[PDB]
Amino acid sequence: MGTLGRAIYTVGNWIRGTGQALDRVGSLLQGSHRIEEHLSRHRTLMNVFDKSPLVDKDVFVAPSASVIGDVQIGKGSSIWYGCVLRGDVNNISVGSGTNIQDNTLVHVAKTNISGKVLPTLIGDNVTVGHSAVIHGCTVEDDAFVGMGATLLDGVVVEKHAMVAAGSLVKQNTRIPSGEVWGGNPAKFMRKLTDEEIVYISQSAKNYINLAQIHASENSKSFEQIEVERALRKKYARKDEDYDSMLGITRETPPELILPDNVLPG
Amino acid sequence: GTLGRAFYSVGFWIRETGQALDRLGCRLQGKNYFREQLSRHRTLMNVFDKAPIVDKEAFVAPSASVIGDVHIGRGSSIWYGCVLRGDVNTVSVGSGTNIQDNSLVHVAKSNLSGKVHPTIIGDNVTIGHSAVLHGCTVEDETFIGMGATLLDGVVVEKHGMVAAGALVRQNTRIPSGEVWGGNPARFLRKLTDEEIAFISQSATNYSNLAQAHAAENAKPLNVIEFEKVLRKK
């Protein structure tokens, strides 16, 4: 503080001005070709056509996800990195405890080619795998859509049904309960064992638990990010021998400890 | 050229030095705001002098990636999560064409498998959600099904349709008014006139939808969200 504080602050101002002027000169020498990085204009939640997404309290939405228009997401659900839920021409409804995994597209249609156009309905405790594409179809509760799979308009995935990873489910196809379909075009493969039904439920619950740690991390402020970066560096290695010489026991701070429900055991 | 590249390199040295000086000045004032991890994503990214040329009436979603020599025409639209990378060669998109969410339109990364083919997208073309176009030409008024992949050398003649989830092998030509689908892509049937009408009307409806999304994205950033993020505890 004080006079020395003020003098150093003023000298820092001069140095900053010089630095920014040098940056401008360097930009001029580049021929102005480099496009400047700007503040982020991506909006995680957006209105369109006076439609606002209705998202529950306990929903993980990755900052990189796009939730647009008339979207409803229920309790315990999770929208992961790169997901796009565009409800601009119709409604998208997501039940409770349902995960929509990375890079997935969910869209609707205003008017399909033939037949009654329907919104996109995804029920409770549904798992949708990475980079799936859901378009104007219905997924009922406790169903499983595999990663890379594609559901076209009018598709109904019934309760306790599975769509295999990478499948192309043609328009108006109905996957009945207890079966798994797959291939291109998607067709019946075999019945679902009870162990797989338990697997589906476990997948939904595990993703509910994963969403918590991801949501906690993504919502931290700049100060807390800095605090935890310093702590992480502090506790990255150890010298328990020198600690025993000092007679102390270094303990991992709780902000670096994950909950047991996400640990492999 | 080479002289431009040398000036670009020397320019980066002057910039590196200036930004280092600015950080010194902020450190003397006890500021650490430069340590904040902010996204360096650029909607339009240049690779030296290969920059994207985008028409003023073309909607580009902010989260989309347009890298290198990419041309987007009037009334066209690049939706959320799309990636267009023309660096080893060029990528051109015609007018009134919609490239839907999470689509990838790129050229071959290396010339190891021969000369790198550019990607040409015609006019009033529809490219479905999460489709992969790799060094292919797609003529005017064609329909690329969502989730479909087009490999290098492919030509989709005007009024051609590629079914959803199809895999069009390398150097395949899709004739006009034909619907091809499956892996590998094979002729399914002929295109009907109602579907041609749907092609054109869908390209028009998406141009109007692109306009609506462009107005909601150009709305000024809300200060209240900024203050809420800033004052978190």
Binding site: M1, L4, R6, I8, Y9 | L28, Q29, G30
Partner: peptide
């Protein structure tokens, strides 16, 4: 308006003193 960290300010003064002193040391030898 003012830099608060006193130890940082004293370190800055020490660094400046070292630089000016090295310059004087060359200039007078």
């Amino acid at each position: 308006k003012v830099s608060e960290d006193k130890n940082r300010n004293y370190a800055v003064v020490a660094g400046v003193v070292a630089i000016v002193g090295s310059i004087g040391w060359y200039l007078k030898a």
